[PDB]
Amino acid sequence: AFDGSIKSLLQGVSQQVPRERLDGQVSVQLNRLSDVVNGNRRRPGARY
Amino acid sequence: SIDPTTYVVTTVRNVPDGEYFVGLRYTSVLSPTPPLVRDANGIVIGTY
């Protein structure tokens, strides 16, 4: 058995077949942030 | 010691007469960043 690691998660959504997606693209994102420095975390709440 | 009324200062023993400087102190904090493990292609592994 072998191991590995996904390069990054900072290129947002994509809809191409997995053979051609660039490095960092993901399949689904919703109510998240693509923030650098802090990572791929949740968005804050909306204030009234 | 420092006289509260006249602000005269007495130094420690055995200092000869001459010229001296007088001032205030400050700190010089520093803090490196923790090391990292990086493979041939530059990917980061073993964070935990």
Side-chain angles (χ1 to χ4, degrees), chain A, chain B residues 1-2 4-27 29-48:
Chain A
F2 303 95
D3 56 4
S5 66
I6 279 171
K7 277 203 176 142
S8 70
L9 308 170
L10 308 176
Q11 307 293 101
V13 174
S14 175
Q15 295 194 335
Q16 292 166 267
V17 295
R19 281 192 31 108
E20 311 206 40
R21 301 186 185 196
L22 286 188
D23 303 348
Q25 298 185 351
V26 299
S27 182
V28 174
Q29 205 171 35
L30 182 85
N31 290 308
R32 309 285 289 204
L33 300 182
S34 196
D35 195 353
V36 193
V37 76
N38 263 17
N40 187 321
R41 72 185 195 290
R42 292 176 76 203
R43 71 154 169 88
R47 181 154 65 90
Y48 170 78
Chain B
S1 76
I2 306 186
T5 308
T6 70
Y7 296 91
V8 178
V9 181
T10 316
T11 71
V12 292
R13 263 164 156 263
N14 290 72
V15 305
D17 299 338
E19 305 293 281
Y20 297 85
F21 279 116
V22 55
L24 306 179
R25 299 165 93 143
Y26 57 99
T27 63
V29 172
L30 177 135
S31 180
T33 183
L36 261 182
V37 183
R38 186 168 252 109
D39 63 358
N41 312 274
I43 306 288
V44 166
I45 65 189
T47 55
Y48 192 75

Coordinates of all heavy atoms in Angstrom, one line a residue, unseen atoms left out:
Chain A
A1 N 0.8 -1.2 0.0 CA 0.0 0.0 0.0 C 0.9 1.3 0.0 O 2.0 1.2 0.5 CB -0.9 0.0 1.2
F2 N 0.3 2.3 -0.6 CA 1.1 3.6 -0.7 C 0.2 4.7 0.0 O -0.9 4.5 0.3 CB 1.3 4.0 -2.1 CG 2.1 2.9 -2.9 CD1 1.5 2.0 -3.7 CD2 3.5 2.9 -2.8 CE1 2.2 1.0 -4.4 CE2 4.2 1.9 -3.5 CZ 3.5 1.0 -4.3
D3 N 0.9 5.8 0.2 CA 0.2 7.0 0.8 C 0.3 8.2 -0.1 O 1.0 8.1 -1.2 CB 0.7 7.3 2.2 CG 2.2 7.5 2.2 OD1 2.8 7.5 1.1 OD2 2.8 7.6 3.3
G4 N -0.2 9.3 0.3 CA -0.2 10.5 -0.5 C -0.9 11.7 0.2 O -1.3 11.5 1.3
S5 N -0.9 12.8 -0.5 CA -1.5 14.0 0.1 C -2.1 14.9 -1.1 O -1.4 15.0 -2.1 CB -0.5 14.8 0.9 OG 0.5 15.3 0.1
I6 N -3.2 15.5 -0.8 CA -3.8 16.4 -1.8 C -3.0 17.8 -1.6 O -2.8 18.2 -0.5 CB -5.3 16.6 -1.5 CG1 -6.1 15.5 -2.2 CG2 -5.8 18.0 -2.1 CD1 -7.5 15.4 -1.8
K7 N -2.7 18.4 -2.8 CA -1.8 19.5 -2.8 C -2.4 20.7 -2.0 O -1.8 21.3 -1.1 CB -1.5 19.9 -4.2 CG -0.3 19.1 -4.8 CD 0.3 19.9 -5.9 CE 1.5 19.1 -6.5 NZ 1.6 19.2 -8.0
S8 N -3.6 21.1 -2.3 CA -4.2 22.3 -1.7 C -5.7 22.3 -2.0 O -6.2 21.4 -2.7 CB -3.6 23.6 -2.2 OG -3.9 23.8 -3.6
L9 N -6.4 23.2 -1.4 CA -7.9 23.3 -1.4 C -8.3 24.8 -1.6 O -9.2 25.3 -1.0 CB -8.5 22.8 -0.2 CG -8.1 21.3 0.2 CD1 -8.7 21.0 1.6 CD2 -8.6 20.3 -0.8
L10 N -7.6 25.5 -2.5 CA -7.8 27.0 -2.6 C -8.1 27.4 -4.0 O -7.7 28.5 -4.4 CB -6.5 27.7 -2.1 CG -6.0 27.3 -0.7 CD1 -4.7 28.0 -0.4 CD2 -7.1 27.6 0.3
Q11 N -8.7 26.6 -4.9 CA -9.1 27.0 -6.2 C -10.6 26.8 -6.5 O -11.0 26.9 -7.7 CB -8.3 26.2 -7.2 CG -6.8 26.3 -7.0 CD -6.2 27.6 -7.2 OE1 -5.9 28.4 -6.3 NE2 -6.0 28.0 -8.5
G12 N -11.4 26.7 -5.5 CA -12.8 26.7 -5.7 C -13.4 25.5 -6.5 O -12.7 24.5 -6.7
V13 N -14.6 25.7 -7.0 CA -15.3 24.6 -7.6 C -14.9 24.4 -9.1 O -14.3 25.3 -9.7 CB -16.8 24.8 -7.5 CG1 -17.6 23.8 -8.3 CG2 -17.3 24.9 -6.1
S14 N -15.1 23.2 -9.6 CA -14.9 22.9 -11.0 C -15.8 21.9 -11.5 O -16.5 21.2 -10.6 CB -13.4 22.5 -11.2 OG -13.2 22.1 -12.6
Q15 N -16.0 21.7 -12.8 CA -16.9 20.8 -13.4 C -16.3 20.0 -14.5 O -17.1 19.3 -15.2 CB -18.2 21.5 -13.9 CG -19.0 22.2 -12.8 CD -20.4 22.6 -13.2 OE1 -20.6 22.8 -14.4 NE2 -21.3 22.7 -12.3
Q16 N -15.0 20.0 -14.7 CA -14.4 19.1 -15.6 C -14.2 17.7 -15.0 O -14.3 17.5 -13.8 CB -13.0 19.6 -16.0 CG -13.1 20.9 -16.8 CD -11.7 21.6 -16.9 OE1 -11.4 22.4 -16.1 NE2 -10.9 21.2 -17.9
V17 N -13.9 16.7 -15.9 CA -13.7 15.4 -15.5 C -12.4 15.4 -14.6 O -11.5 16.2 -14.9 CB -13.5 14.4 -16.7 CG1 -14.9 14.3 -17.4 CG2 -12.5 14.8 -17.6
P18 N -12.2 14.5 -13.7 CA -11.0 14.6 -12.8 C -9.7 14.5 -13.5 O -8.7 15.0 -12.9 CB -11.2 13.4 -11.8 CG -12.7 13.0 -11.9 CD -13.1 13.3 -13.3
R19 N -9.7 14.0 -14.7 CA -8.4 13.8 -15.4 C -7.8 15.2 -15.7 O -6.5 15.3 -15.8 CB -8.6 13.1 -16.7 CG -8.7 11.6 -16.6 CD -8.6 10.8 -17.9 NE -7.8 11.5 -18.9 CZ -6.6 11.1 -19.3 NH1 -6.0 10.0 -18.8 NH2 -5.9 11.9 -20.2
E20 N -8.6 16.2 -15.8 CA -8.1 17.5 -16.3 C -8.1 18.7 -15.3 O -7.6 19.7 -15.6 CB -8.9 17.9 -17.6 CG -9.1 16.8 -18.6 CD -9.3 17.3 -20.0 OE1 -8.7 18.4 -20.4 OE2 -10.1 16.7 -20.7
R21 N -8.7 18.5 -14.1 CA -8.8 19.6 -13.2 C -7.4 20.0 -12.7 O -6.5 19.2 -12.6 CB -9.6 19.1 -11.9 CG -11.0 18.7 -12.3 CD -11.8 18.4 -11.0 NE -13.1 17.8 -11.3 CZ -14.1 17.8 -10.4 NH1 -14.0 18.2 -9.2 NH2 -15.3 17.2 -10.8
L22 N -7.3 21.3 -12.6 CA -6.0 21.9 -12.1 C -5.8 21.6 -10.6 O -6.7 21.1 -9.9 CB -6.0 23.4 -12.3 CG -5.8 23.9 -13.7 CD1 -5.6 25.4 -13.7 CD2 -4.6 23.2 -14.4
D23 N -4.6 21.8 -10.1 CA -4.3 21.6 -8.7 C -5.0 22.5 -7.8 O -5.0 23.7 -8.0 CB -2.8 21.7 -8.5 CG -2.0 20.8 -9.4 OD1 -2.6 19.9 -10.0 OD2 -0.7 20.9 -9.5
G24 N -5.7 22.0 -6.8 CA -6.4 22.8 -5.8 C -7.9 22.9 -6.0 O -8.5 23.3 -5.1
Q25 N -8.4 22.5 -7.2 CA -9.8 22.6 -7.4 C -10.6 21.5 -6.7 O -10.1 20.4 -6.5 CB -10.1 22.6 -8.9 CG -9.5 23.7 -9.7 CD -9.9 23.8 -11.1 OE1 -10.5 22.8 -11.6 NE2 -9.5 24.8 -11.8
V26 N -11.8 21.8 -6.3 CA -12.6 20.9 -5.5 C -13.9 20.7 -6.3 O -14.1 21.2 -7.4 CB -12.9 21.4 -4.1 CG1 -11.6 21.5 -3.3 CG2 -13.7 22.7 -4.1
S27 N -14.8 19.9 -5.8 CA -16.0 19.5 -6.5 C -17.3 20.2 -6.1 O -18.1 20.6 -6.9 CB -16.3 18.0 -6.3 OG -17.4 17.5 -7.1
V28 N -17.4 20.5 -4.8 CA -18.5 21.3 -4.2 C -18.1 22.1 -3.1 O -17.3 21.7 -2.2 CB -19.6 20.3 -3.8 CG1 -20.8 21.0 -3.1 CG2 -20.2 19.5 -5.0
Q29 N -18.6 23.3 -3.0 CA -18.3 24.3 -1.9 C -19.6 25.1 -1.7 O -20.3 25.5 -2.6 CB -17.1 25.2 -2.2 CG -16.4 25.7 -1.0 CD -15.1 26.4 -1.3 OE1 -15.0 27.1 -2.3 NE2 -14.2 26.3 -0.4
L30 N -19.9 25.3 -0.4 CA -21.1 26.0 0.0 C -21.0 26.6 1.4 O -20.7 25.8 2.3 CB -22.3 25.0 -0.1 CG -23.7 25.6 0.2 CD1 -24.3 26.2 -1.1 CD2 -24.6 24.5 0.7
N31 N -21.2 27.9 1.5 CA -21.1 28.6 2.8 C -19.7 28.4 3.4 O -19.6 28.5 4.6 CB -22.2 28.1 3.7 CG -23.6 28.5 3.3 OD1 -23.8 29.7 3.1 ND2 -24.5 27.6 3.2
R32 N -18.7 28.1 2.6 CA -17.3 28.1 3.0 C -16.6 29.3 2.5 O -17.1 30.2 1.9 CB -16.6 26.8 2.4 CG -17.4 25.5 2.7 CD -17.2 25.1 4.1 NE -15.9 24.6 4.4 CZ -15.5 23.8 5.3 NH1 -16.4 23.3 6.1 NH2 -14.2 23.5 5.5
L33 N -15.3 29.4 2.9 CA -14.4 30.4 2.5 C -13.2 29.8 1.9 O -12.7 28.7 2.3 CB -14.0 31.4 3.6 CG -15.1 32.1 4.4 CD1 -14.5 33.0 5.4 CD2 -15.9 33.0 3.4
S34 N -12.6 30.4 0.8 CA -11.4 30.0 0.2 C -10.2 30.8 0.8 O -9.3 31.1 0.1 CB -11.5 30.2 -1.3 OG -10.4 29.5 -2.0
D35 N -10.3 31.2 2.0 CA -9.4 32.1 2.6 C -8.0 31.6 2.7 O -7.8 30.4 3.0 CB -9.8 32.5 4.1 CG -9.1 33.7 4.6 OD1 -8.2 34.2 4.0 OD2 -9.5 34.2 5.7
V36 N -7.0 32.4 2.3 CA -5.6 32.1 2.5 C -5.3 32.4 4.0 O -6.1 32.9 4.7 CB -4.7 32.9 1.6 CG1 -3.3 32.4 1.6 CG2 -5.3 32.9 0.1
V37 N -4.1 31.9 4.4 CA -3.5 32.2 5.7 C -4.3 31.5 6.8 O -3.6 31.0 7.7 CB -3.4 33.7 5.9 CG1 -4.7 34.4 6.3 CG2 -2.3 34.0 7.0
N38 N -5.6 31.5 6.7 CA -6.4 30.8 7.7 C -6.9 29.5 7.3 O -7.4 28.7 8.1 CB -7.6 31.7 8.1 CG -7.3 32.5 9.4 OD1 -6.2 32.7 9.8 ND2 -8.4 33.0 10.0
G39 N -6.9 29.2 6.0 CA -7.3 27.9 5.5 C -8.8 27.9 5.0 O -9.4 29.0 4.9
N40 N -9.3 26.7 4.7 CA -10.6 26.5 4.2 C -11.6 26.3 5.3 O -11.9 25.2 5.7 CB -10.6 25.4 3.2 CG -11.9 25.3 2.4 OD1 -13.0 25.4 3.0 ND2 -11.9 24.9 1.1
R41 N -12.1 27.4 5.9 CA -13.0 27.3 7.0 C -14.4 27.8 6.6 O -14.7 28.2 5.5 CB -12.4 28.2 8.2 CG -12.4 29.7 8.0 CD -11.7 30.4 9.1 NE -12.0 31.8 9.1 CZ -11.6 32.7 8.2 NH1 -10.9 32.3 7.2 NH2 -12.0 34.0 8.3
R42 N -15.3 27.9 7.6 CA -16.7 28.4 7.4 C -16.7 29.9 7.4 O -15.9 30.6 7.9 CB -17.6 27.8 8.5 CG -17.8 26.3 8.5 CD -18.6 25.9 9.6 NE -20.1 26.2 9.5 CZ -20.9 26.3 10.4 NH1 -20.6 26.1 11.7 NH2 -22.2 26.6 10.2
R43 N -17.8 30.4 6.8 CA -18.0 31.8 6.7 C -18.7 32.3 8.0 O -19.3 31.6 8.7 CB -18.9 32.2 5.5 CG -20.3 31.8 5.6 CD -21.2 32.7 4.8 NE -22.6 32.2 4.6 CZ -23.5 32.5 5.5 NH1 -23.4 33.3 6.6 NH2 -24.8 32.0 5.3
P44 N -18.4 33.6 8.4 CA -19.1 34.1 9.6 C -20.6 34.3 9.3 O -21.1 34.1 8.2 CB -18.4 35.5 9.8 CG -17.2 35.4 9.0 CD -17.5 34.6 7.8
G45 N -21.3 34.7 10.4 CA -22.8 34.9 10.3 C -23.1 36.3 9.8 O -22.3 37.2 9.8
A46 N -24.3 36.5 9.4 CA -24.8 37.8 8.9 C -25.5 38.6 10.1 O -26.3 38.0 10.8 CB -25.8 37.6 7.8
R47 N -25.1 39.8 10.2 CA -25.5 40.6 11.4 C -26.7 41.5 10.9 O -26.7 42.1 9.8 CB -24.4 41.5 11.9 CG -24.7 42.3 13.1 CD -23.5 42.6 14.0 NE -22.5 43.4 13.3 CZ -22.4 44.7 13.3 NH1 -23.3 45.4 14.0 NH2 -21.5 45.3 12.7
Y48 N -27.6 41.7 11.8 CA -28.8 42.6 11.5 C -28.5 44.0 11.9 O -28.0 44.3 13.0 CB -30.0 42.1 12.2 CG -31.2 43.0 12.2 CD1 -32.0 43.1 11.1 CD2 -31.5 43.8 13.3 CE1 -33.1 43.9 11.0 CE2 -32.6 44.6 13.2 CZ -33.4 44.7 12.1 OH -34.5 45.5 12.1
Chain B
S1 N 19.3 53.2 46.5 CA 18.2 54.0 47.0 C 18.0 55.2 46.2 O 18.9 55.7 45.5 CB 18.4 54.3 48.5 OG 19.4 55.3 48.7
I2 N 16.8 55.8 46.4 CA 16.5 57.1 45.8 C 15.7 57.9 46.9 O 14.7 57.5 47.4 CB 15.6 57.0 44.5 CG1 16.3 56.0 43.5 CG2 15.4 58.3 43.9 CD1 15.6 55.9 42.2
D3 N 16.2 59.1 47.2 CA 15.6 60.0 48.2 C 14.3 60.5 47.7 O 14.3 61.2 46.6 CB 16.6 61.1 48.6
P4 N 13.2 60.3 48.3 CA 11.9 60.8 47.8 C 11.8 62.3 47.7 O 11.1 62.8 46.9 CB 10.9 60.2 48.7 CG 11.6 60.0 50.0 CD 13.0 59.6 49.6
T5 N 12.6 63.0 48.6 CA 12.4 64.5 48.6 C 13.4 65.2 47.7 O 13.0 66.2 47.0 CB 12.7 65.0 50.0 OG1 11.8 64.3 50.9 CG2 12.4 66.5 50.2
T6 N 14.6 64.7 47.5 CA 15.6 65.4 46.7 C 16.0 64.6 45.5 O 16.8 65.2 44.7 CB 16.9 65.7 47.5 OG1 17.6 64.4 47.8 CG2 16.5 66.4 48.8
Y7 N 15.6 63.4 45.3 CA 15.9 62.6 44.1 C 17.4 62.3 44.0 O 17.9 62.4 42.9 CB 15.3 63.2 42.8 CG 13.8 63.3 42.8 CD1 13.2 64.4 43.3 CD2 13.1 62.3 42.3 CE1 11.8 64.5 43.3 CE2 11.7 62.4 42.2 CZ 11.1 63.5 42.7 OH 9.7 63.5 42.7
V8 N 18.1 62.1 45.1 CA 19.5 61.7 45.0 C 19.6 60.2 45.0 O 18.8 59.5 45.7 CB 20.3 62.3 46.2 CG1 21.7 61.9 46.2 CG2 20.1 63.8 46.3
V9 N 20.6 59.7 44.2 CA 20.7 58.3 44.0 C 22.1 57.9 44.5 O 23.1 58.6 44.4 CB 20.6 58.0 42.5 CG1 20.8 56.5 42.2 CG2 19.3 58.5 41.9
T10 N 22.1 56.7 45.1 CA 23.3 56.1 45.7 C 23.6 54.8 45.0 O 22.8 54.0 44.8 CB 23.2 55.9 47.2 OG1 22.6 57.0 47.8 CG2 24.6 55.6 47.8
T11 N 24.9 54.7 44.5 CA 25.2 53.6 43.7 C 25.8 52.5 44.5 O 26.1 52.6 45.7 CB 26.2 54.0 42.6 OG1 27.5 54.3 43.2 CG2 25.7 55.2 41.8
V12 N 26.1 51.3 43.9 CA 26.6 50.2 44.6 C 28.1 50.4 45.0 O 28.7 51.4 44.5 CB 26.5 48.9 43.8 CG1 25.0 48.5 43.7 CG2 27.2 49.1 42.4
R13 N 28.7 49.6 45.8 CA 30.0 49.9 46.3 C 31.1 49.8 45.3 O 30.9 49.1 44.2 CB 30.3 48.9 47.5 CG 30.1 49.4 48.9 CD 30.0 48.2 49.9 NE 30.3 48.7 51.2 CZ 31.5 48.6 51.8 NH1 32.6 48.1 51.1 NH2 31.7 49.0 53.0
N14 N 32.2 50.5 45.5 CA 33.4 50.3 44.7 C 33.3 50.9 43.3 O 34.0 50.3 42.4 CB 33.9 48.9 44.7 CG 34.5 48.5 46.1 OD1 33.7 48.3 47.0 ND2 35.8 48.3 46.2
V15 N 32.5 51.8 43.0 CA 32.5 52.5 41.7 C 33.3 53.8 41.8 O 33.1 54.6 42.7 CB 31.0 52.8 41.3 CG1 30.2 51.6 41.3 CG2 30.4 53.9 42.1
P16 N 34.4 53.9 40.9 CA 35.2 55.1 41.0 C 34.6 56.3 40.4 O 33.6 56.2 39.6 CB 36.5 54.7 40.2 CG 35.9 53.7 39.2 CD 34.8 53.0 39.9
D17 N 35.1 57.5 40.7 CA 34.6 58.7 40.1 C 34.9 58.8 38.7 O 36.0 58.5 38.2 CB 35.2 59.9 40.9 CG 34.8 59.9 42.4 OD1 33.8 59.3 42.7 OD2 35.6 60.5 43.2
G18 N 34.0 59.3 37.9 CA 34.1 59.5 36.5 C 32.8 59.8 35.8 O 31.9 60.3 36.4
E19 N 32.8 59.5 34.5 CA 31.6 59.8 33.6 C 30.8 58.5 33.5 O 31.3 57.4 33.5 CB 32.1 60.2 32.2 CG 33.0 61.5 32.3 CD 32.3 62.7 32.7 OE1 31.6 63.3 32.0 OE2 32.5 63.1 33.9
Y20 N 29.5 58.7 33.5 CA 28.5 57.6 33.4 C 27.3 58.0 32.6 O 27.0 59.2 32.4 CB 28.1 57.1 34.8 CG 29.3 56.5 35.6 CD1 30.0 57.4 36.4 CD2 29.5 55.2 35.6 CE1 31.1 56.9 37.1 CE2 30.6 54.7 36.4 CZ 31.3 55.5 37.2 OH 32.3 55.0 37.9
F21 N 26.6 57.0 32.0 CA 25.4 57.2 31.3 C 24.2 56.7 32.2 O 24.4 55.9 33.2 CB 25.3 56.4 30.0 CG 26.0 57.1 28.9 CD1 27.2 56.5 28.3 CD2 25.6 58.3 28.4 CE1 27.8 57.1 27.3 CE2 26.2 58.9 27.4 CZ 27.4 58.3 26.8
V22 N 23.0 57.2 32.0 CA 21.8 56.9 32.7 C 20.6 56.9 31.7 O 20.5 57.8 30.9 CB 21.5 57.9 33.8 CG1 21.5 59.3 33.3 CG2 20.3 57.6 34.6
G23 N 19.8 55.8 31.8 CA 18.7 55.7 30.9 C 17.7 54.7 31.4 O 17.5 54.5 32.6
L24 N 17.0 54.1 30.4 CA 15.9 53.2 30.7 C 16.0 51.9 29.9 O 16.8 51.8 29.0 CB 14.5 53.8 30.4 CG 14.2 55.2 31.0 CD1 12.9 55.7 30.6 CD2 14.3 55.1 32.6
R25 N 15.3 50.9 30.3 CA 15.4 49.5 29.8 C 14.4 49.3 28.7 O 13.4 50.0 28.6 CB 15.4 48.5 30.9 CG 16.5 48.6 31.9 CD 16.2 47.8 33.2 NE 16.8 46.5 33.1 CZ 17.3 45.8 34.1 NH1 17.3 46.3 35.3 NH2 17.8 44.6 33.9
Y26 N 14.6 48.2 28.0 CA 13.6 47.7 27.0 C 13.9 46.2 26.7 O 15.0 45.7 27.0 CB 13.5 48.5 25.7 CG 14.8 48.6 25.0 CD1 15.1 47.8 23.9 CD2 15.8 49.6 25.4 CE1 16.3 47.9 23.2 CE2 17.0 49.7 24.7 CZ 17.3 48.9 23.6 OH 18.4 49.0 23.0
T27 N 12.9 45.5 26.1 CA 13.0 44.1 25.8 C 13.2 43.9 24.3 O 12.8 44.8 23.5 CB 11.8 43.4 26.3 OG1 10.6 43.8 25.7 CG2 11.7 43.6 27.8
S28 N 13.7 42.7 23.9 CA 14.0 42.4 22.5 C 13.5 41.0 22.2 O 14.2 40.2 21.6 CB 15.5 42.5 22.3
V29 N 12.2 40.8 22.4 CA 11.6 39.5 22.2 C 11.8 39.0 20.8 O 11.9 39.8 19.8 CB 10.1 39.5 22.5 CG1 9.4 38.2 22.1 CG2 9.9 39.7 24.0
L30 N 11.9 37.7 20.5 CA 11.9 37.1 19.2 C 11.4 35.7 19.3 O 11.5 35.0 20.4 CB 13.4 37.0 18.6 CG 13.5 36.4 17.3 CD1 14.4 37.2 16.3 CD2 14.0 34.9 17.4
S31 N 10.8 35.2 18.2 CA 10.1 33.9 18.2 C 10.2 33.2 16.9 O 9.5 33.7 15.9 CB 8.7 34.0 18.7 OG 8.0 32.8 18.7
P32 N 11.0 32.2 16.7 CA 11.0 31.5 15.4 C 9.7 30.9 15.0 O 8.7 30.9 15.8 CB 12.2 30.5 15.5 CG 12.9 31.0 16.7 CD 11.9 31.6 17.6
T33 N 9.7 30.2 13.8 CA 8.6 29.4 13.3 C 8.9 28.0 13.4 O 10.0 27.6 13.2 CB 8.2 29.8 11.9 OG1 7.1 29.1 11.5 CG2 9.4 29.5 11.0
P34 N 7.9 27.1 13.8 CA 8.2 25.7 14.0 C 8.7 25.1 12.7 O 8.3 25.5 11.6 CB 6.9 25.1 14.4 CG 5.9 26.0 14.0 CD 6.5 27.4 14.0
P35 N 9.6 24.0 12.7 CA 10.1 23.4 11.5 C 9.0 22.7 10.7 O 7.8 22.6 11.1 CB 11.1 22.4 12.0 CG 11.5 22.9 13.4 CD 10.2 23.5 13.9
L36 N 9.4 22.2 9.5 CA 8.5 21.5 8.7 C 9.2 20.4 7.9 O 10.4 20.5 7.8 CB 7.8 22.5 7.6 CG 6.4 23.0 7.9 CD1 5.9 23.8 6.8 CD2 5.4 21.8 8.1
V37 N 8.5 19.4 7.5 CA 9.0 18.3 6.7 C 8.5 18.5 5.2 O 7.3 18.7 5.0 CB 8.6 16.9 7.2 CG1 9.2 15.8 6.4 CG2 9.0 16.8 8.7
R38 N 9.4 18.4 4.3 CA 9.0 18.7 2.9 C 9.7 17.6 2.0 O 10.9 17.5 2.1 CB 9.5 20.1 2.5 CG 9.0 20.5 1.1 CD 9.2 22.0 1.0 NE 7.9 22.7 1.0 CZ 7.5 23.5 2.0 NH1 8.2 23.7 3.1 NH2 6.3 24.1 1.8
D39 N 8.9 17.0 1.1 CA 9.4 15.9 0.3 C 10.1 16.6 -1.0 O 10.4 17.8 -1.1 CB 8.3 15.0 -0.1 CG 7.2 15.7 -0.9 OD1 7.3 16.9 -1.2 OD2 6.3 15.0 -1.4
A40 N 10.4 15.7 -2.0 CA 11.1 16.1 -3.1 C 10.4 17.2 -3.9 O 11.0 18.2 -4.4 CB 11.4 14.9 -4.0
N41 N 9.1 17.0 -4.1 CA 8.3 18.0 -4.9 C 7.9 19.2 -4.1 O 7.2 20.1 -4.7 CB 7.0 17.2 -5.5 CG 7.4 15.9 -6.1 OD1 7.7 15.8 -7.3 ND2 7.3 14.8 -5.3
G42 N 8.2 19.3 -2.9 CA 7.9 20.5 -2.1 C 6.6 20.4 -1.3 O 6.2 21.3 -0.6
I43 N 5.9 19.2 -1.3 CA 4.7 19.0 -0.6 C 5.0 18.9 0.9 O 6.1 18.3 1.3 CB 3.9 17.9 -1.1 CG1 3.6 18.0 -2.6 CG2 2.6 17.7 -0.4 CD1 2.6 19.1 -3.0
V44 N 4.1 19.3 1.8 CA 4.3 19.2 3.2 C 3.6 17.9 3.7 O 2.5 17.6 3.4 CB 3.7 20.4 3.9 CG1 3.6 20.2 5.4 CG2 4.6 21.6 3.6
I45 N 4.3 17.2 4.6 CA 3.8 15.9 5.1 C 4.2 15.8 6.6 O 5.1 16.5 7.1 CB 4.4 14.7 4.3 CG1 5.9 14.6 4.5 CG2 4.0 14.8 2.9 CD1 6.6 13.6 3.6
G46 N 3.5 14.9 7.3 CA 3.8 14.6 8.7 C 3.5 15.8 9.7 O 4.3 15.9 10.6
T47 N 2.4 16.5 9.4 CA 2.1 17.6 10.4 C 1.7 17.1 11.7 O 1.8 17.8 12.7 CB 1.0 18.5 9.8 OG1 -0.1 17.7 9.5 CG2 1.5 19.2 8.5
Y48 N 1.2 15.9 11.8 CA 0.7 15.3 13.1 C 1.5 14.0 13.5 O 1.1 13.3 14.4 CB -0.8 15.0 13.0 CG -1.4 14.7 14.3 CD1 -1.7 15.7 15.2 CD2 -1.8 13.3 14.7 CE1 -2.3 15.4 16.5 CE2 -2.4 13.0 15.9 CZ -2.6 14.1 16.8 OH -3.2 13.8 18.0

